[PDB]
Design a protein around this ligand. Structure first.
Ligand code: CLA
Ligand code: CLA
Ligand code: CLA
Ligand code: CLA
Ligand code: CLA
Ligand code: CLA
Ligand code: CLA
Ligand code: CLA
Ligand code: CLA
Ligand SMILES: CC1=C[C@H](O)CC(C)(C)[C@@H]1/C=C/C(C)=C\C=C/C(C)=C\C=C/C=C(C)\C=C/C=C(C)\C=C/C1=C(C)C[C@H](O)CC1(C)C
Ligand code: SF4
Lengths: 211, 40, 163, 208, 211, 64, 146
């Protein structure tokens, strides 16, 4: 077990066992039954892995935007910029997004139920590559860099993934009361820290004391 | 004191503290953001 | 609009009802002096009344021929015509609170019955335990489906019958 | 075997006399249980230590105001200093609430579990940040070795409490003889020293 | 007539408390007991307690009339504004002609003096208009207790205990229906409270808004 | 021994009983040929206030 | 009209519950495992077992009639007033006042009971005197049952 989210005396009951990114953080005891703890673990990954690849489109691009290299729009209004384009792809995108994910995800849903269960003649000829080593960590998807014996580079995958999940929650909240992008919000806290915060300007609290 | 805390743990007393909380919370929730009907 | 109802902003009876309810206070305000406390009390009520009417109009409510706001319940029409906060969203707010009361009381009942003299624990509560469960019930839906999918929610024909 | 608040009264059974500033004073039978007693001695000391730290701040300013320096009354000081400050209210509060939640929480879990914060998690500090006693830490909060002797540590605990009880009574004084006179504490002192017989609480126009 | 009857109910309970022809041994059963049994054709409300429970309704009925007498008489024949030419009573002196008929007590007292209470919405007397209704609710609510019996209720709770048992959420303190004696007491209490509170609203609103 | 063991819990099968499909401790068992020997004690009271009753061999079965 | 329909549903569902219970629990209850041996209509099983007054299926039908009359009352009170406003031409009377209970007591009951109550006045008598007499006659018979 890795260090404790409280340094002091918060005894966990079922997290002493091995697992990735185990810091003993389960007050509500939602991981008591092991069968559904096994399910929530994969949820942290798909949310972790998806959130990180999403945060780059908000982050890697807006940094280049504030510097002035590109004139792309902000994420809070990128959706209304696509469909008015002459060469556009109007909303058959919601449904095709579901028809495409529905094929992959149920293949992932039936793996957690029956691990390594991809029949011999079910797919054309690549039935062997689709078998996975463990749940959440398949083999033939990564081309290099998964043959070490100390496999816990996974801890980087989680600490980076949990962090990004905070980012989008902050992007969405910052972009609902500040009215500006995430990086524009950063340039202000650096230029005038004490004035631009969640307390006084960002109306997250009813503070009206003009005296 | 062990018996006093036990008296305070009876049903009539714990319910009195509950009522002051729920009623105090609702009245305070009507005093500020006055008379709500539609939720934004 | 829908169901032959006008919005409250465009209605005449809605504004008629505002001019009426303010006229009662203005007549009542004439009796007292300007700087007195009864004057301050009525002016505040006037300020609240003016705020109640404009906020209900701003919220896209629907007022009928009588001039009073009406609510819509079908989520389809509510979402289509932007009237979801009225009924459809109040339903989820209450269910989360109602479930929280159930998941808490159910756990206090089960845990006290695992010990000696559970009858005393009902009339003389274990307040440290009750507060512990009351602050652990924020994610009550997760535990329910966890307990349903597991099968430890329901009892199985170990209950008393009558015939 | 020791002095008491009212001579001749039988002291309570739970107040043995080991605690600092123990005079057998608990008619309400509070701190009769070990766990509550373990909580109150830590509550008394913080209410003390904040009183000393605060009351000294009032005397320093009220003396500097009487001498000529630009210091305001301890009352209505947060109102006139915020009018002309670059830090808005709200950014100053949750800089205090957020920073104290760290300390105030670590102090809590040393109470519920002694020696727990010395695991070395916080920046690799182990020998410090583990409590010597309940409300009396050391190592880092005692840079000078003024606590590695039980003979001189037991009486210092008696002075920390005696100058403290006195201190948080004084803060109640400032509240009271401000509401009556609406003047600084030091000004009320020089008046009593000037005409002791005439200017007392009886002649303030209040409390009668 | 209302006083001689109220004495009959109480005095009968006193003398026949210790023994009667129907039940020669009541003293061993005690002061308050619901019934000896379905035998002798029926022995329900034979105790002295149940005589008091009956005397309350009569006593309440007798006292209510002694109040209507004071209100209509003093409004019509006594109270009023004095002018240059005599006195103008509140109800024009209608006690002499209308009171002889029961319909007069329904028309000229109830259907008339209830105008100030009904029309109290939107004024300072609005609380009396609410209590006027609230008092009717508690009065009727008592009828569930007086008319029914603890048998129907105890069986209903069993079918409710099944559901509370099915979900493993049941009280260790078993639920039991209100006792026969309590049921009767609960009735007369909610009965008198609703019967008395109505007048308390029907009077003060009538008289504060003078006439 | 004729019947269940002392101190053993058993489940009732009288349809008439307040304790039907419910569990109780065996207080004692008589081996003299009585029709209803098995004495059982429950924590929950019945409607009258009695918490014990003599049951038979066929009317009781193993727990749960 | 929304609230009136919902109030009706409450009356219909509860009335069925009072009856359905007296039927299914007619054969036996935990309080009385053998009701079938006694009959449909009996007094009670005695003051024992905490009290058994009004258990029989007859006593369930007995209690449902009170609710039945209450349910049909609402159904019928809603028909009359909604039609009076139509016949009088002022439909706005029902729409604005039927949303709160004092409207039912003020505008329907107390108001429309003016010509009736004056059936026999101390000055004279109209043709509605027979109805005011019957009006009270009902008020009295209802009280004698109490
Ligand atoms: C976790 C990452 C994260 C970060 C780095 C920021 C950063 C910022 N937020 Mg923000 N925010 C976040 C999450 C985050 N937020 C989330 C999850 C929410 C929803 C609850 C919000 C809601 C929010 C509002 C409503 C507002 C900001 C604002 C701001 C800016 C000013 C500081 C402030 O108001 O205090 C931040 C206040 C908070 C309550 C969030 C702090 C708590 C986090 C979780 C602690 C994390 C620890 C530490 C900082 C991590 C270091 C990461 C770093 C090295 C990259 C600043 C750029 C203000 C603005 O207008 O921007 C100009 C503003 O009005 N935030
Ligand atoms: C005003 C008179 C009155 C009232 C209010 C009721 C109300 C009720 N009767 Mg009922 N009944 C009555 C007269 C009345 N009855 C009469 C005269 C008879 C014939 C004698 C019956 C015979 C009868 C039978 C046979 C049955 C009922 C049943 C019921 C319940 C049905 C379920 C329900 O509707 O949910 C609730 C309805 C309400 C109106 C809620 C009432 C409580 C409100 C919400 C007040 C809330 C409390 C508030 C906080 C104030 C508390 C403060 C105070 C404690 C100090 C219900 C509570 C049935 C039942 O058992 O239900 C399962 C049933 O079987 N009744
Ligand atoms: C001083 C006057 C007084 C009054 C008015 C009451 C009133 C009450 N007591 Mg009581 N009590 C008293 C003195 C008093 N007590 C004394 C001197 C003792 C000895 C220490 C006790 C010991 C005692 C015990 C052991 C119990 C009561 C219980 C009760 C409640 C009966 C259960 C019920 O009907 O609701 C039924 C409740 C439900 C079906 C669901 C719970 C929802 C409730 C209504 C919410 C809580 C209501 C809250 C307490 C109201 C505020 C208090 C009120 C009097 C202002 C009732 C409100 C019982 C109880 O459980 O209290 C609630 C109970 O077990 N009392
Ligand atoms: C089914 C019965 C019922 C329902 C559905 C409602 C619903 C409501 N009432 Mg009402 N009320 C009721 C019974 C009921 N009440 C009764 C019986 C009375 C008489 C005692 C009142 C007296 C009353 C008054 C005096 C007021 C209300 C108000 C309100 C509204 C304020 C909601 C709020 O607190 O803001 C939102 C609160 C939250 C979001 C926090 C709750 C969720 C927690 C915190 C989680 C709300 C829509 C207020 C209003 O504005 O009227 C429209 C108000 O002034 N009620
Ligand atoms: C018993 C419950 C109930 C009832 C009576 C209605 C009634 C109605 N719905 Mg509705 N609805 C409900 C529940 C209900 N809804 C729920 C739970 C949902 C999911 C949130 C919806 C989602 C929904 C949508 C999305 C739409 C309706 C629409 C409609 C209307 C047209 C007929 C219809 O449904 O298509 C025929 C159904 C055949 C089975 C009608 C007023 C439509 C509308 O707006 O009408 C103009 C519409 O577009 N409903
Ligand atoms: C944890 C307590 C608890 C729980 C989980 C339930 C759960 C349930 N009850 Mg219920 N009930 C309770 C207490 C509880 N009840 C109490 C105290 C009473 C006496 C007034 C009743 C009387 C009752 C009746 C008459 C009926 C139910 C019914 C039901 C079922 C449908 C929900 C409903 O509408 O009920 C009704 C909800 C209430 C009457 C409100 C209960 C009062 C409060 C809000 C709940 C008590 C919480 C508790 C005091 C807090 C303790 C917490 C602890 C940490 C200290 C459902 C499974 C119905 C059913 O049979 O299902 C088909 C039904 O007809 N209950
Ligand atoms: C926890 C105790 C405490 C607290 C909350 C304060 C609070 C304050 N002190 Mg202060 N002070 C304290 C102890 C304390 N003092 C002590 C112990 C001393 C030395 C004995 C001083 C000496 C001091 C000086 C010399 C001045 C303040 C000033 C101030 C105010 C402005 C703070 C600032 O500059 O930023 C503020 C009200 C300043 C002030 O009055 O506002 C201009 C100021 O000039 N303090
Ligand atoms: C903590 C110690 C303390 C000290 C040193 C003082 C000192 C003073 N107070 Mg004061 N006061 C205090 C506490 C204290 N007060 C408390 C707790 C209250 C609230 C009850 C008051 C309420 C108060 C009012 C209302 C007034 C004063 C006034 C005064 C001044 C004139 C003395 C007088 O009129 O007698 C008044 C004395 C008292 C009412 C007794 C106070 C109670 C404490 C416990 C007294 C004993 C303190 C300590 C144990 C012994 C001294 C320690 C040390 C000096 C040796 C003087 C500077 C007057 C003033 O403004 O001066 C012009 C004035 O009008 N005080
Ligand atoms: C003996 C004491 C007593 C008396 C005398 C009364 C008298 C009365 N009560 Mg009652 N009441 C009492 C006790 C009493 N109460 C008690 C203890 C309670 C419970 C606490 C109640 C609760 C109660 C309620 C709830 C009500 C009454 C009401 C009434 C009045 C009935 C209204 C009426 O019918 O008008 C006069 C009746 C007539 C003019 C018709 C007379 C019928 C005659 C006698 C029969 C003739 C039949 C015919 C000629 C034969 C035909 C034969 C063929 C050839 C055609 C009436 C004056 C009602 C009321 O308040 O009035 C609004 C009401 O609803 N009472
Ligand atoms: C709040 C806020 C606000 C303001 O305004 C701003 C700021 C300051 C920014 C803040 C925030 C922060 C955060 C939270 C976050 C960020 C970032 C991250 C975490 C991530 C990314 C990002 C992340 C990520 C993961 C991305 C990428 C990665 C990867 C691996 C991909 C791919 C791959 C894989 C799969 C495997 C193979 O074999 C290989 C490859 C092909 C190579
Ligand atoms: S009160 Fe009930 S149980 Fe007693 S004799 Fe009468 S009907 Fe039977």
């Amino acid at each position: 077990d890795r260090p404790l989210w409280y340094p002091g005396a918060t005894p966990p009951a079922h997290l002493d066992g091995s697992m990735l990114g185990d810091y003993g953080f389960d007050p509500l005891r939602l991981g008591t039954n092991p069968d559904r703890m096994k399910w929530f673990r994969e949820a942290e990954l798909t949310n972790g892995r998806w959130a990180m690849a999403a945060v780059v489109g908000i982050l890697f691009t807006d940094v280049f935007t504030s510097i002035g290299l590109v004139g792309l729009p902000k994420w809070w209004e990128a959706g209304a910029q696509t469909y008015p384009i002459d060469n556009q792809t109007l909303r058959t995108l919601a449904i095709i997004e579901f028809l495409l994910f529905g094929w992959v995800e149920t293949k992932r849903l039936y793996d957690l139920r029956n691990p390594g269960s991809q029949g011999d003649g079910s797919f054309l000829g690549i039935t062997d590559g689709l078998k996975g080593t463990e749940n959440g960590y398949p083999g033939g998807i990564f081309d290099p860099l998964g043959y070490s014996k100390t496999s816990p580079e996974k801890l980087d995958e989680l600490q980076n993934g949990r962090l990004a999940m905070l980012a989008f929650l902050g992007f969405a909240s910052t972009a609902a009361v500040n009215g500006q992008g995430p990086i524009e919000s950063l340039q202000t806290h650096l230029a005038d820290p004490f004035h631009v915060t969640f307390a006084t300007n960002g109306v997250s609290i009813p503070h009206f004391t003009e005296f | 004191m062990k018996d006093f805390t036990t008296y305070l743990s009876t049903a009539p007393v714990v319910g009195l503290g509950w009522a002051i909380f729920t009623s105090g919370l609702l009245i305070e929730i009507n005093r500020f953001f006055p008379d709500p009907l539609v939720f934004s | 609009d829908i169901a032959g109802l006008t919005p409250c902003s465009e209605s005449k009876a809605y504004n008629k009802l505002e001019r009426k309810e303010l006229k009662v206070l203005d007549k009542r305000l004439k009796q007292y002096e300007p700087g007195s406390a009864p004057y301050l009390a009525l002016q505040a009520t006037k300020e609240r009344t003016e705020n109640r009417f404009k906020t209900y109009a701003k919220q896209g409510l629907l007022c009928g021929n009588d001039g009073l706001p009406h609510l819509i319940s079908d989520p389809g029409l509510a979402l289509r015509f932007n009237h979801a906060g009225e009924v459809f969203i109040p339903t989820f707010g209450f269910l989360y609170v109602a479930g929280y009361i159930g998941h808490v009381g159910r756990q206090y009942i089960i845990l006290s019955k695992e010990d000696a003299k559970p009858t005393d624990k009902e009339i003389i509560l274990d307040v440290p335990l009750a507060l512990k469960l009351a602050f652990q019930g924020w994610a009550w839906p997760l535990a329910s489906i966890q307990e349903l999918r597991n099968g430890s929610l329901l009892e199985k024909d170990e209950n008393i019958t009558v015939s | 075997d020791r002095p008491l608040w009212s001579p001749g009264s039988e002291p309570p059974a739970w107040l043995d006399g080991s605690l600092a500033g123990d005079y057998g004073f608990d008619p309400l039978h509070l701190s009769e249980e070990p766990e509550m007693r373990k909580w109150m001695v830590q509550a008394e000391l913080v209410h003390c230590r904040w009183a000393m730290l605060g009351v000294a701040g009032i005397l320093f300013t009220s003396i500097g105001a009487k001498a000529g320096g630009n210091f305001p009354d301890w009352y209505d000081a947060g109102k006139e200093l915020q009018k002309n400050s670059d830090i808005p209210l709200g950014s100053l509060i949750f800089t205090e609430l957020l920073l104290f939640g760290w300390v105030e929480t670590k102090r809590l879990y040393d109470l519920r579990n002694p020696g727990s914060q010395g695991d070395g998690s916080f920046l690799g500090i182990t020998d410090g940040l583990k409590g010597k006693e309940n409300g009396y830490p050391g190592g880092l909060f005692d840079p000078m070795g003024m606590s590695k002797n039980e003979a001189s540590f037991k009486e210092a605990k008696q002075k920390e409490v005696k100058n403290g009880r006195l201190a948080m009574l004084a803060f109640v004084g400032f509240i009271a003889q401000h509401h009556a006179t609406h003047k600084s504490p030091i000004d009320n002192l020089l008046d009593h020293v000037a005409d002791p017989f005439h200017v007392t609480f009886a002649t303030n126009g209040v409390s009668i | 007539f209302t006083i001689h009857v109220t004495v009959l109910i109480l005095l009968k309970g006193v003398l026949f408390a210790r023994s009667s022809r129907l039940i020669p041994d009541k003293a061993n059963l005690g002061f308050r007991f619901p019934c000896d049994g379905p035998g002798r054709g029926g022995t329900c409300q034979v105790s002295a307690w149940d005589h008091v429970f009956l005397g309350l309704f009569w006593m309440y009925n007798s006292l209510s009339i002694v109040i209507f007498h004071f209100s209509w008489k003093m409004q019509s024949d006594v109270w009023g504004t004095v002018t240059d030419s005599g006195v103008s009573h509140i109800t024009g002196g209608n006690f002499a002609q209308s009171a002889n008929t029961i319909n007069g007590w329904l028309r000229d007292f109830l259907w008339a003096q209830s105008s100030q209470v009904i029309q109290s919405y939107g004024s300072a007397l609005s609380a009396y208009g609410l209590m006027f209704l609230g008092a009717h609710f508690v009065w009727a609510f008592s009828l569930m207790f007086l008319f029914s019996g603890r048998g129907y209720w105890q069986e209903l709770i069993e079918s409710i205990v099944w559901a509370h048992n099915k979900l493993r959420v049941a009280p260790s303190i078993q639920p039991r229906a209100l006792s026969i004696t309590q049921g009767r007491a609960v009735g007369v209490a909610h009965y008198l409270l609703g019967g008395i509170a109505t007048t308390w609203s029907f009077f003060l609103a009538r008289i504060i808004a003078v006439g | 021994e004729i019947g269940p063991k002392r101190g053993s819990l058993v489940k009732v099968l009288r349809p008439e009983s307040y304790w039907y499909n419910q569990v109780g401790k065996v207080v004692s068992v008589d081996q003299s040929g009585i029709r209803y020997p098995v004495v059982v004690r429950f924590e929950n009271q019945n409607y009258a206030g009695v918490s014990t009753n003599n049951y038979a061999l066929d009317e009781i079965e193993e727990v749960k | 009209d929304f609230l009136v329909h919902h109030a009706i549903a409450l009356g219909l569902h509860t009335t069925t519950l009072i009856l359905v219970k007296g039927a299914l629990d007619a054969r036996g209850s935990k309080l009385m495992p053998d009701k079938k041996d006694f009959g449909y209509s009996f007094p009670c099983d005695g003051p024992g077992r905490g009290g058994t007054c009004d258990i029989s299926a007859y006593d369930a039908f007995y209690l449902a009639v009170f609710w039945m009359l209450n349910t049909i009352g609402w159904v019928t009170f809603y028909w009359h007033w909604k039609h009076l406003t139509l016949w009088q031409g002022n439909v706005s009377q029902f729409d604005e006042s039927s949303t709160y209970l004092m409207g039912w007591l003020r505008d329907y009951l107390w108001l429309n009971s003016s010509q009736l109550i004056n059936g026999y006045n101390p000055f004279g008598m109209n043709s509605l005197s027979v109805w005011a007499w019957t009006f009270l006659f009902g008020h009295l018979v209802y009280a004698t049952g109490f």
